[PDB]
C-alpha cells in the first residue's frame, strides 16, 4: 500500500550513469518486494546538461526535482568542462544552486572502515586494525560558500577579493540538533569543529553548540580546531563518533573521512531540508579515469538510495533490506575492482545484479 | 662578506631552553668551520617573560629582536600559565604580535619522511615506503584570521557573527614569489591550494598566481582545491613539491604534513618578511610533559638554525652542512627517544654533541 512516490534521477557524468543504472536495478527490486509505488524521471545535470542545453542546471531539471519526493543524484563533472567559468562549471553551477534552492542545510556523510577492508585503508595497519566509524554532519547552506558580501573590488596593488564566513544563530541551532540527534543513535559523542581561537563566527558556533548540548546531557561533547582535526583523523580516527562542522570545515574533513576509509566507492551522502526532502548521492566524484569501463563500485550509489528510502520515503524497511543485501555480498567476498584491488573483482553490472537479486530474494 | 651577524635568541619555556642549547652548540661549530661572526643576545619570551616581567612579550625583547638580523625562537607555554586569560597566555601574547610587528608574511614549513624513520609515519607502510618531501608555504599575516569586517551583531535567531576571507593583490604576489623561488631550488613544482570553484578570494588568488608564474617559466604550476589536497596528502604525498597556500589553507595543510611525517621533533619553521629578516623555531610546541628531562629531540630547533643561516644570513653552505650532519647522524643509527627506545636512543645533549661534531668534522 504505497503513495506512488516520485524520484528525480540525475545520473550526471562519468561513472554516474553506470552506478545509477545499478541503483535503479535495486529500486526495481524494492518496488516489487515491498510493493512500493515508485515513479522516476531522468534529467540532465552537469556536463551532460552543458552538452545538451548549454547550462549545467536546466530549469526543466530544477522543475523536475521540485515535482519529486527526493533526488537520486550520481556525479557531475569532468575534464571536458574543466575549462569553463566557475559559474559555468558542472560541479558548482549545479550543486551549490540545488542545495540553496531546496534549502538542504543538512549534509550527512557516514564513513566507516569495513572489517576486512583494512588493506585499502591508507593509514598504518595498526591504526587501521583499531578501526573507525564516523558520521560527518556538515552545514550545507550558509557560511562562506553563500555569505555576503562576496566579490572583487579595485585594481593595482590594493585590488582585492573577499568572501564572508557569516552564520546566524538559527543556522547553527538547526545543524547542531542534527548532530546531537544522530549521536544518540550512534555512540553518543559529538566533536564540534571550529576555529574559535580567532574566528568570531566560530566563537558564536561554539556558544550555540554548547547551548544545544544542554538538551543532550547523555552525549559527550568536545570542541576541536580544524587544524587539529585534520591531524587527528590520521593519528587516531577511532576517537570520533559524530563530527559537527561548518560548510567549509565540513567540506574538508568529510572528504578526509572518505579518504581514510580507503573505500570511497562504498560511501553515501544525504543532503536534507527541514521537510525531509533530500538529495542522495555517492560521496565520491565522476571518476573519469574508469568512466564507462564497467569497473566503478555501485555500492555508494545503492547505499544512497537506501538513505533516500529511509529519510525521504519513510521506508526504513526497504533501506535496511538494501544494506543487508550489500553486507551479504561482501560477506560472500564479492568485490568490485577497487576493493579487490583488481584481481577476482566483479563488474559494476554484476555487483548491481547481485545486490538487486539479494534484495528481491528477501535474503 | 661583511660578517658580524647578530641573532636574538628567545628560548622560551619547557623544552625550548633545552633544544635551544643544542642549536647554539651547533652554531658554534658553524662559527668555527665557516669563519662566521655570529653574536647573540638572549631575551625572555612567553611564560618566563610573564614570570620575570609580568607579560609574555616585554619591550626589551621586541627591541632586541629589532636590533638583530634574525630571531632564533624556541617554544613557549605550559601549565604554569594556563590559569591566565587566554589572551594573556605565552604563545598568543608573544608569537602573534611578533609576526605582526615584523610583518612576517611568509611561513615555510619543510616536511620530509627521513630514511630510517618510516616506521613512525602514520600512513600505510607501502605509502610511507614511497617517501615524500614537501615544503608548505603559508601566507601568514592575512586572510580570514585578520580580515575585516569581523564581529558579532543582532539579537534572537538572526544574531550573527562573521569573519572575512579577504586578500589583496600585493599579499598574493609576495607569497606566490616565495613559493616559486623555493620550488626553483627544489624540484620545480608549485601546487597552489585554493577553493576557486566557490570562493571569490580564491578566484583572484588563482588568477594572480597564474600571472606570477609567467615570471618563473622554469617552475611548473598546478592548482588543487583544499578538500582534494587534504585527501591527496594521505593518499600520495610523494606527488607534492611546494604547496602555496592562504593562511587558513596553509595552517591546515602544514599541520597535516607534520602529522604524516609522524615525527614533529624533526620539523623546523621559518617565518620571513620582505627584507629577509625571519623568526625561526621548531614546528612543535614546548612539550611540558618532558621539559627539563634532557630527552627532547633537538633536531627541529637545529634545522631551524639551518633555515636561519640559509634565509637570513646568506649562509646556504652552513645550512647545508647542518642538514648533512643530521643525515649522517641518522645513517649511523643515532636517534632521540621520540625515534627509538631505551639504549637505542640518546639524550638531547648527546644528539647535539653528535651533530655539532659531524659539522666540525665535515670541514
Ligand atoms: Mn568536497
Ligand atoms: Mn595550526
Curated annotation (Swiss-Prot), chains A, B:
Assembly: Homodimer.
Task performed by this protein: Catalyzes the oxidation of 3-carboxy-2-hydroxy-4-methylpentanoate (3-isopropylmalate) to 3-carboxy-4-methyl-2-oxopentanoate. The product decarboxylates to 4-methyl-2 oxopentanoate.
Residue sites binding Mg(2+) per the record: 227, 251, 255
Protein name according to UniProt: 3-isopropylmalate dehydrogenase
GO CC terms of this entry: cytosol
Subcellular location: Cytoplasm
Binding site for Mn(2+): 227, 251, 255
Gene source species: Salmonella typhimurium (strain LT2 / SGSC1412 / ATCC 700720)
Entry-linked PANTHER family: 3-ISOPROPYLMALATE DEHYDROGENASE
Alphabetical list of SMART domains matching this protein: Iso_dh (SM01329)
Keyword Nucleus among record annotations: no
HAMAP family documented for this protein: LeuB_type1
Modulation of this protein's activity: Inhibited by p-hydroxymercuribenzoate and N-ethylmaleimide, but not by iodoacetate or iodoacetamide.
pH dependence remark: Optimum pH is 9.0. Optimum pH is 9.5.
PROSITE patterns per the UniProt record, alphabetical: IDH_IMDH
Top-rank taxon, per record: Bacteria
Catalysed reaction equations from the record: (2R,3S)-3-isopropylmalate + NAD(+) = 4-methyl-2-oxopentanoate + CO2 + NADH
EC number: 1.1.1.85
